[PDB]
């Protein structure tokens, strides 16, 4: 469920090799997505 999305080179938070790790989750309330900065 771990998807990596490379940070665009024109982004304010851009660093070499940085990406957004976006995961989808769902519990009893409902669905949501988590974006964690990784290398």
């Amino acid at each position: 469920c771990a998807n990596f999305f490379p940070v665009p080179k024109d982004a304010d938070d851009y660093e070499a090799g940085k990406a957004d790790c976006v995961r989808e989750k769902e519990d009893e309330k409902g669905k949501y997505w988590l974006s964690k900065p990784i290398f």
Binding site: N3, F5, V7, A11, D12, D13, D20, V22, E24, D27, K29, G30, K31, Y32, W33, L34, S35, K36, P37
Partner: protein, 853 residues
């Protein structure tokens, strides 16, 4: 047991419900048929709301627990920033947290954002109170991994605000405060806090502009230091200014990056995860909003709402914990409502679109996990935190400030029916009827809000404090109209400048009832703490005449209130030196202009402290003076023995003290003593203190179980004090107008006083409801009373809610100073709400209010 019919001015009034459908619906389940979310979306969002409230020491939702990411990244930054100026370190801490935090996006939400790594979590604050964090480590909600969290707290312990402040007080004094008996514990020990964010600056200017202002100031300061000839007595001033401005830049750049990364998450989900095309388009709209906002000025209502929510997260959760939701939301959002709904220049919207947006705001606030200490959760059962926004009132010219944004805010509350955020309405005679009707709709639905504050009283209060400004830049006569409640009861400036930045300026409680107990026991608290709580002001034998009691109390009060304020100012001293808030500083025009930290610069003083259970101590003194020193029916030893025996015997004696003239009955004898007590002791001795900002400290009465047997006829630990200046539960026996006449007698040396009043359901929900209420408010205002809030709910429905809680979820009631779902309050609290006297209105009452039908 309430009237359904009343003859008045030769006219028979039929107190029958407006909507005939209400006659069909059973009275014991009325409030389960009132909610009406504007859209299917907000209906879904409420049903699946990630509630963050708790009661009896545990969260009602099972997944709620503490996060660790804030702790982790704040620690990492602090280790790395060693040696650097503290303002810059604090900015770097914020930046690291924001840069590395896992961000959250949920289905159906339009206002996006969160303050922890998981939508069910809340962040913690090791930089504030070591003890508070330790409590969570010893709970079912500890941040994980527990070992890392423990290591983090130990690292922060000597750096914490609590550790900074404690050495400058006698440990015995702090011990007395920490008992939370006569004095509320100082904020540096609990981490509790409040703030009035300068939202106006963010929405109007955007953060990019604040960065350019700071960078310009830096260059000017650097140029000044390079200018021949150097003057060592002036040139070094640039250092602290440069430090603050650089920190502002770091903080703002990180907030922009954070907002845009949030937008990137929306774009990613819309392009890779979301399958609904309608939601995909919506996520792309939100992404564009996050990209521009708050980097740029807001152009429309959607921009403004997202900006405001982002700013709220930083100022109240991420940069530092702060309880509250202080803001003038209608006035703040109006230009952007105008752009969107009225002129439709950008983000064109209908009024109902605006209503839905506010609904979504209320739900996001309802999902906001508050990382307050466990001890400060127990005081407010059924709530997640105190969120109080302000609307209504008057503009700088004293004209009506009510508008259609005000109405959108009020309708959204009536529709979505959430306990939080609560609302304060500033009432003036200028306020249009169209908005007043919306106010009444909320109140008549039993929400408990809007609570009504006296507009003129607050405005004049701002003018008075402004006189004490240390840099002569207090609120102008025009700015004085720009005020909001900080938390529940205390007025403060809102706007781009001069707003209150910390609870250290004002807030915190003191308990006159307990102080009276220990006065009659040589400063020893036998009933609760079982220790020496105050000064040894003498034994029972020494106390002669009613003045000795009146004078021994002052000595106890003086000792207590001095600690209450000095602990706050010492906190302030270290807050500005080690807990700098460069983001808050960046969006304050004064901080930006002068290059000072938000906690350092204080242009508008607003010092106050909360005397709680003052009524209990008041009614007690009336019964002492009358039955001991004017009738001599009982002696002090007989009274003291009876009190320590909790009146096991002396039952006729307790009734004798209980029957003594009380507060809220227009009783000349009872009101005579209590009026002087409110103005000479409670306010008088307290006003003698000057706080950090150079202003006086004035009382804010608001809201008992830790109070022992008192001469007012109270059993031990009897928690039935309605709160503030309102009559004790069951003490009022001459109707609502008699209560209204008593309170008006207090006019001197007060900053504010809470008033709880329960009104009859059939009247309020009848077609005559608005007329009588509006006339009540009219009278209340002209009696120059500071505050009033209402409870409109029948005993039967509350009883039914006790029996079948799963059938009465949407029942909301008003407790102390906040609203909550009735089924979330423990039985003991529930029974206390029921015990409150539901005021009926007779023909004599209506004639006093000058009503017309």
């Amino acid at each position: 047991v309430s009237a359904k019919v009343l003859e008045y001015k030769g006219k028979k009034l039929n107190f029958t419900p407006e909507d005939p459908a209400e006659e069909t619906i059973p009275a014991d389940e009325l409030h389960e048929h009132l909610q009406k979310p504007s859209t299917a979306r907000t209906k879904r969002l409420k049903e699946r709301c990630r509630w963050k409230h708790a009661s009896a020491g545990e969260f009602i939702e099972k997944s709620v627990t503490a996060g660790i990411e804030r702790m982790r990244y704040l620690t990492e930054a602090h280790k790395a920033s060693e040696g650097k100026p503290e303002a810059i370190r604090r900015a770097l801490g914020l930046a690291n947290v924001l840069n590395k935090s896992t961000l959250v996006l949920q289905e159906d939400e339009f206002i996006v954002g969160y303050h922890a790594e998981d939508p069910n979590m809340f962040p913690l604050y090791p930089e504030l109170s070591h003890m508070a964090v330790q409590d969570y480590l010893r709970s079912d909600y500890s941040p994980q991994p527990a070992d890392e969290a423990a290591a983090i707290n130990e690292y922060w312990k000597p750096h914490s605000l609590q550790s900074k402040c404690q050495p400058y007080f006698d440990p015995a004094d702090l011990g007395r405060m920490y008992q939370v008996s006569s004095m509320e514990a100082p904020s540096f020990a609990s981490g509790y806090n409040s703030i009035v964010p300068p939202y106006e600056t963010v929405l109007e200017d955007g953060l990019l502009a604040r960065i350019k202002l700071a960078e310009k100031h830096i260059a000017e300061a650097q140029a000044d230091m390079s200018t021949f000839p150097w003057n060592g007595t002036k040139g070094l001033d640039n250092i602290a200014k440069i430090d603050n401005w650089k920190a502002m830049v770091i903080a703002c750049k990180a907030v922009i990056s954070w907002a845009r990364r949030q937008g990137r998450l929306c774009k990613i989900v819309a392009e890779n995860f979301e399958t609904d095309p309608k939601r995909q388009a919506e996520l792309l709209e939100i992404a564009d909003i996050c990209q521009r906002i708050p980097a740029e000025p807001c152009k429309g209502l959607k921009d403004a709402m997202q900006a405001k929510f982002f700013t709220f997260l930083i100022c109240h959760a991420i940069e530092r914990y702060a309880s509250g939701y202080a803001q003038k939301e209608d006035t703040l959002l109006w230009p952007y409502y105008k752009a969107s709904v009225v002129d439709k220049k950008f983000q064109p919207m209908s009024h109902m679109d605006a209503v839905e947006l506010v609904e979504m705001e209320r739900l996001k606030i309802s999902e906001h996990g508050a990382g307050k200490s466990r001890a400060y959760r127990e005081i407010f059962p059924g709530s997640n935190d105190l969120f109080i926004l302000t609307v209504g009132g008057t503009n700088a010219k004293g004209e009506d400030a009510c508008n259609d944004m005000t109405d959108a805010i009020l309708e959204a509350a009536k529709r979505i029916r959430t306990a939080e955020p609560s609302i304060v309405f500033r009432y003036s005679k200028k306020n249009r009827e169209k908005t007043l009707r919306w106010v009444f709709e909320c109140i008549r639905d039993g929400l408990g809000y809007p609570s009504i504050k006296h507009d003129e009283i607050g405005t004049e209060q701002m003018k008075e404090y402004a006189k004490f400004s240390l840099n002569g830049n207090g609120a102008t006569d025009e700015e004085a109209h720009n005020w909001v409640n900080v938390l529940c009861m205390s007025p403060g400036i809102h706007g781009r400048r001069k707003t209150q930045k910390t609870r250290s300026e004002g807030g915190g409680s003191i308990f006159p009832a307990k102080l009276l107990e220990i006065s009659l026991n040589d400063g020893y608290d036998w009933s609760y703490a079982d220790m020496q709580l105050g000064p040894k002001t003498g034994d029972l034998s020494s106390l002669k005449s009613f003045e000795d009691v009146w004078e021994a109390f002052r000595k106890q009060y003086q000792y207590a209130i001095n600690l209450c304020i000095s602990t706050k100012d010492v906190s302030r001293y270290f807050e500005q030196r080690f807990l700098q808030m460069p983001f808050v500083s960046a969006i304050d025009d004064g901080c930006m202009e002068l290059g000072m930290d938000a906690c350092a610069l204080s242009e508008q003083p607003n010092g106050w402290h909360n005397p709680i259970t003052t009524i209990v101590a008041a009614n007690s003194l009336v019964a002492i003076k009358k039955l001991v020193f004017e009738e001599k029916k009982y002696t002090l030893e007989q009274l003291s023995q009876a009190l320590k025996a909790n009146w096991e015997g002396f039952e006729e004696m307790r009734v004798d003290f209980k029957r003594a003239p009380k507060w809220g009955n227009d009783d000349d004898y009872a009101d005579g003593i209590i009026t002087r007590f409110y103005e000479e002791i409670i306010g008088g001795e307290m006003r003698k203190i000057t706080n950090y900002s150079g202003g006086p400290v004035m009382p804010t009465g608001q809201a008992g179980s830790r109070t022992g047997p008192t001469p007012d006829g109270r059993f031990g630990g009897e928690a039935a004090d309605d709160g503030g200046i309102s009559p004790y539960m069951g003490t009022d026996k001459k109707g609502p107008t008699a209560v209204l006449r008593s309170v008006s007698k207090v006019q001197k040396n007060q900053k504010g006083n809470l008033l709880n009043q329960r009104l009859s359901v059939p009247i309020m929900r009848s077609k005559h409801g608005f007329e009588i209420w509006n006339s009540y408010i009219k009278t209340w205002h002209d009696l120059n009373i500071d505050h009033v809030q209402f409870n409109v709910v029948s005993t039967d429905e509350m009883r039914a809610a006790q029996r079948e809680p799963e059938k009465h979820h949407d029942l909301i009631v008003r407790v102390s100073g906040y609203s909550a779902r009735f089924v979330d309050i423990p039985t003991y609290g529930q029974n206390t709400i029921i015990a409150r006297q539901e005021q009926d209105f007779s023909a004599s009452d209506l004639e006093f209010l000058n009503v017309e039908i």
